[PDB]
Symmetry: D2
Subunit: 549 residues, 4 copies
């Protein structure tokens, strides 16, 4: 119903409510304070952060998990620019995030004198949608279109610039009912049958999972197709969480990082490769496509063809629908060829070798393997796990097959540090009854640790682990390998236990290997935020780096 709104801010908040938004992350400022004020009169919870970048990170987690866009709210100028890295990361990983940023008044003389920054131009390179509202009456539609652009197709981030006068002034208009997802049909039946027939013909078929395959709305369909077909599966990191070793016996590991993955050998062996929700950007096709197999592309969008990615059959449409139909045209489960069976057998052996459940590993500082094992003991199907960027990331990725977590946020193409804690707080807000474990190094921790105050204020049940080496190890090992000397990668030590407790959170510092498990256990059992510092000995990283592509 077209109503008369005293403020555009009230219409904005009503639209957000129509979108199903449960909370908003951000920092208020003069230009955007009317939206924060209007938020007081709604069901939406205002979550003040300590740095805008983290508002975007928290929003992305909400988006990845619920599939519905997380929302960040910031003021003009630095308020907006402090979000950029956050928006780039969300867009990069395909997480739906909608950011509402304040701006000077439309007629502001500083506008023409360029006293104010062209935020739309700045955000354009790192978003799917970036626009400024210049017409008060287009307020509801623009916000609504920001959500659609962010959640539909290949998810991403959307930025909306709100001139101060527009949100403060009165407007005429009605709330646009969130239609959500359009009713898109599965691929054509003829197309599907053609693929079912290829499947019934293939001796060495395999599924390669990409971003869209890990989306929640495709979870049931994917499960059903794998159970019916029993065809091997490998996943890019943007789908790292869609399937794991413990839920599918024919899982071949994630591809894109290590040079000895069963997934890579099976793809090379395949006579039929079926990609689901995959995009060449998730993993260089040159690395796996040998052109010897028939290539099927299934996604909500046609393929971005290229030298090593020219599908023979393209099934564009509702992924869930297409997968369900395909599953109904599969007569029996695949009988692995002896070659494929050997490859899976080899992955089994390599996992046996990587395992160290029986090793003492009591050195101090701790061996990455000991920490990884300790982490595996506290993360279970009821726990979410967020991973930052650094050398510890490579170690965890190597053992993803051993983490039985409810879900894991690790994918990070931009390799942005500081994402773990904010990701965990966001993941916690989605399911406050569950526990969340975040892990980072000292580098990334200090970039977003200001949010520890946000965590205590919310009594967020998050346990953050810090691998302590007193430097930027991931960069140090790359310099050492190329130049055999270090530069700008070493810094001083800190008392992280005292650091954490200064926020009011529970802090711990592991002083010996023997103390690791007991400490993590005591930290996990704490009702509220907890931080555990773990001194690490990265001396063996080369042994691990030698397994990289």
């Amino acid at each position: 119903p077209v109503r008369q709104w005293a403020h555009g801010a009230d219409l904005v908040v009503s639209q957000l409510e129509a979108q199903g938004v449960r909370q908003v992350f951000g920092i208020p400022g003069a230009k955007i304070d009317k939206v924060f004020d209007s938020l007081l009169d709604s069901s939406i919870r205002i979550i003040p952060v300590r740095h805008e970048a983290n508002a975007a990170f928290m929003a992305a987690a909400v988006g990845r998990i619920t599939g519905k866009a997380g929302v960040a709210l910031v003021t003009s100028g630095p308020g907006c620019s402090n979000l950029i890295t956050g928006m780039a990361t969300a867009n990069s990983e395909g997480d739906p995030v909608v950011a509402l940023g304040g701006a000077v008044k439309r007629a502001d003389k500083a506008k023409q004198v360029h006293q104010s920054m062209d935020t739309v131009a700045m955000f354009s390179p790192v978003t799917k949608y970036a626009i400024e509202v210049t017409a008060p009456d287009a307020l509801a539609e623009v916000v609504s279109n920001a959500f659609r652009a962010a959640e539909q197709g290949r998810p991403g981030s959307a930025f909306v610039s709100l001139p101060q006068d527009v949100v403060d002034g009165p407007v005429s208009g009605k709330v646009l009912p969130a239609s959500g997802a359009p009713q898109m049909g599965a691929a054509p039946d003829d197309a599907i049958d053609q693929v079912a027939k290829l499947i019934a013909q293939a001796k060495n078929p395999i599924f390669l999972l990409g971003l869209m395959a890990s989306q929640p709305e495709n979870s049931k369909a994917l499960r059903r197709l794998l159970e019916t077909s029993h065809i091997p599966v490998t996943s890019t990191y943007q789908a790292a969480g869609a399937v794991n070793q413990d839920n599918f016996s024919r899982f071949a590991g994630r591809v894109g990082l290590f040079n000895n993955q069963a997934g890579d050998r099976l793809l090379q062996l395949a006579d039929l490769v079926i990609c689901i929700g995959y995009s060449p950007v998730e993993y260089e096709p040159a690395m796996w496509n040998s052109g010897n197999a028939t290539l099927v592309h299934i996604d909500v969008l046609p393929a971005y063809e290229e030298r090593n990615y020219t599908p023979d059959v393209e099934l564009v449409g509702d992924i869930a629908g297409t997968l369900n139909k395909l599953a109904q045209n599969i007569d029996h489960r695949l009988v692995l060829s002896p070659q494929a069976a050997e490859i899976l057998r080899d992955r089994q052996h390599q996992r046996e070798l990587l395992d160290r459940r029986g090793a003492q590993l009591n050195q101090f500082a701790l061996h990455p393997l000991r920490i990884v094992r300790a982490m595996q003991d506290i993360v279970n199907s009821d726990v979410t796990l967020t991973v930052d960027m650094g050398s510890f990331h490579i170690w965890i990725a190597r053992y993803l097959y051993t983490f039985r977590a409810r879900q894991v946020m690790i994918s990070n193409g931009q390799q942005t540090m500081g994402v773990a804690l904010p990701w965990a707080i966001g993941a916690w807000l989605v399911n406050p009854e569950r526990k969340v474990v975040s892990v980072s190094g000292d580098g990334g921790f200090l970039q977003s640790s200001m949010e520890l105050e946000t965590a205590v204020r919310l009594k967020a049940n998050v346990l953050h682990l810090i691998w302590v080496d007193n430097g930027y190890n991931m960069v140090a090992i790359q310099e050492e390998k190329k130049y055999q000397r270090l530069s700008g990668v070493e810094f001083g030590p800190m008392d992280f236990k005292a650091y954490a407790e200064s926020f009011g959170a529970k802090g711990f510092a592991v002083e010996s290997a023997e103390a690791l498990e007991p400490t993590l256990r005591a930290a996990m059992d704490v009702d509220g935020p907890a931080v555990v510092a773990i001194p690490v000995d990265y001396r063996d990283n080369p042994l691990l780096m030698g397994q990289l592509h």
Copy 2:
């Protein structure tokens, strides 16, 4: 199509174009892009030199519009590219698939003290990229066609650095393939089937995509089964006409007395097909008190006045075909609906009776009637922008051409002639007729040389008023005085003959029809200048929104 070692990037480009089915390229050579022109010499692809780059984009658009596959423009760096901009923005607005390949300085000189063409084309294209990685040459070009041809078709630009097209490269040609998209979900279709059965005043609003040849059969099948009233935007102007559907309600978006608008305002159910708000402001017809259904190849580009209740995204032809099978009875018009269609019938009779117009200069109606006589079902009619455009639109219901190119959101002048040459090349055995004002004519008349050189069977008509009338009448209405809309006279007969084309200048009313027939009878290019008396324009303008 295996991976090969190409002597020049230019050779791979040409091969990729052949793979896309390109039959000709429009453009003007330059130092930076010359190797591609040279490479085309060993191709079956025909090189067609134009006289002004803008026209290469116009001709390409017509090719893309008719064939469904991108027309191709090839230009050089700097001014070669900047001259394409308007033609590209026009293609993008009308949804005509066009791929423009533009030359550029060597990659190493880009930063040296080199226009940032990509930044200049982004605002007016769906896809704008510069090849900075030689090994992705075929990739970028191939994806340029995908971007231009798929979803809502549009224009695509690809900047080719000189060193990249001149130097050796490795790569393979990528095969061309509209992916397999299926009809909208059967459940959704059933849902819409229900709404229809429950509607007493249903109506179809056709958009651009509804006019695509891939949906022609399904559309007809849907309309013939339900006999539900239909109205169209100008981008979907040719989807349906008065002759093949008695319940056609006209084109909406220009006149304030259309049966289509009256039916939309009366509707309790509006089903839009291949429609986008940009085609006709929803605020103009959507009262908001009618169930809105959206059917298209893409989700709805929602607006404050366009928030569908049911969105069906997928293959249009498939969707409509299923919908047709879910309709059991032909609609029984309501009293109000019936009245509205009856009015349009009486309205047409009136517009027709409006009768011995032998004045000179010629009365617009006289020119329209004569135009309709020479334009037959085998002829393509292209229409430029100006006052004559309104007169022609007013009578589209009586024009029976193979096809009409008139939709022009940007209102760009000079489109007619190049569109016609482009359209003629797609079907060189047919005749094409383009019409414009004297202002639009001089903006692209240099292509008459191209037409003569090609022996294009195009007849160009010029409504001569010696000014920019469409602007003048607006100035008159608002200011009661004119400024910058009047210019001198010309002898278009000699003008056209100078090109080696047949020229004619109507010097009296009775000479009109005979002149057109003689010009139409010419096997090759011909131009007819027609002096027009725009005195009655104010009476037509009153029928406008």
Copy 3:
């Protein structure tokens, strides 16, 4: 100039233009920008309707180039603006001050489903802004002129939303004022005075700014006092000529045998005045083993091959005047220097002797000699881009015109005619001569109507080869075959007459001179078509870098 309450923003704009001294505006009206055209009706400012927007920018550039004050183009939204782009990029490259005012949709529709013209003009302009604050209307316009006219002159674009120019506004007209910048520091000047006294092979390299009329007297005073050799880029082509300075060494940047390059390579001291690397690649002449001195209105735009040792920034005329007073003796040329100038003298004698060329089609040299005869010291000569351009440049030393417009970094075709019409309007009592090829001609020939309508005393010459020769010879050299550079013939005589202009077509060698004289004698527009035999081009191209 007090603060006032204007009925329409358009009225304030017109007042601001008058304040800038604008005498005329070039352009084409449209709905969005019509109120400004209407407002100009009550102004002393003359409205000059063109036939294609690109030409409004070209004509404006000529106006700005000659008067030192920005020429003005006024166009409407969308295609009106996109059609200006190439003309704007051309102005910006040659340093011609131009201000373009473009219409735009109402501010509220900008985001609605409106080209982002500012983003499209930024790459090719010094200043590009959109007025989003009605109270800053005069501000933005005024600052547009400052940006265009000051420092290194260039083009400026200002987008005017329709509601802003149509709605009432408050504000005052801002008075126009080149600020008071003083000569370079007296210490710096003395430093350079020393270097000169110590140099045995000094030479001046003149750039764009050195050709500005404000520096003409000082320059002459400096050269006459030191008699130090001089060479110029094409942007500074008219600063000095062979007649007024016996130690002139020619124009550098095109031919590989210039005395200027030989002197630069020999120099132990090079003093650049109003020069910028973009005018002539420093890598081409700077060996790096000579003291480099930079004098200009702006700091040096340093490059790997242009890192001055002494940078003098400030008022050029003042700086040069002081430098002249710090020179005590006229330079005594060195043996090598003397030889080099002697060679150019013998070189010119040779280029001259090269003699009964009565072939038909006409030999380029025959056409050049004839052109030099009709071009006198009171005539302005505008030159388009093409092969004829090279021939003319080769003999610039024997052309004695009031002024020559030839510099064209973008190498944009079609500039000649509009430049001439623009130049003629600045001094309507003088004659203007423009020359182009058949390709360049058809890109802007629509302005012949504008010329006839204005009674412009312009003579346009066309070198007719029936193709794009400049491109063809490059294709020949590299591929030994042609592609896309050949088109059909035309009857330019009838073509020109159709506009109401006097047309001539040279049908034999002996007819050339008589034809030009008759065309020159016409008081109004005239066009002469001249068939040319480009067979010897390969022999001229060999003299190119």
Copy 4:
């Protein structure tokens, strides 16, 4: 003197030394680590920060006080985007700051697939000068021009994007002598 440099990074550092730079603030990453490495062989002190934004802030202070541009050094992607607010603030207050940011290799296929962010476009709205080196031989001039644009006229911030292959690969060229301020 035109020399043969094993790495563009070495020429960059030599140019910085010619500019009088005493220290550099930043955080290293794969794309830009060769410049940090080359900094070890110079008189310039490497100052590692904990967040890039602060590298820009520290640089601005150096610039405001000495009048000569402060220098920040960051890696590609988030390394660059984390600087934006810092660059906007320096440019806003008229503080001379020169930021050198890494980038994927020029021919990186991710370039066209837009996998990497157009940093030049992002920094343009908040800087006086923003440019990417696409020609190894224009390395010294571009850095030199960044300082000139930052320190001269109304001071501000300048951004230079350095593709990984350009700083890692060999180059030919000489250090452009810092002329500093023209004699106006």
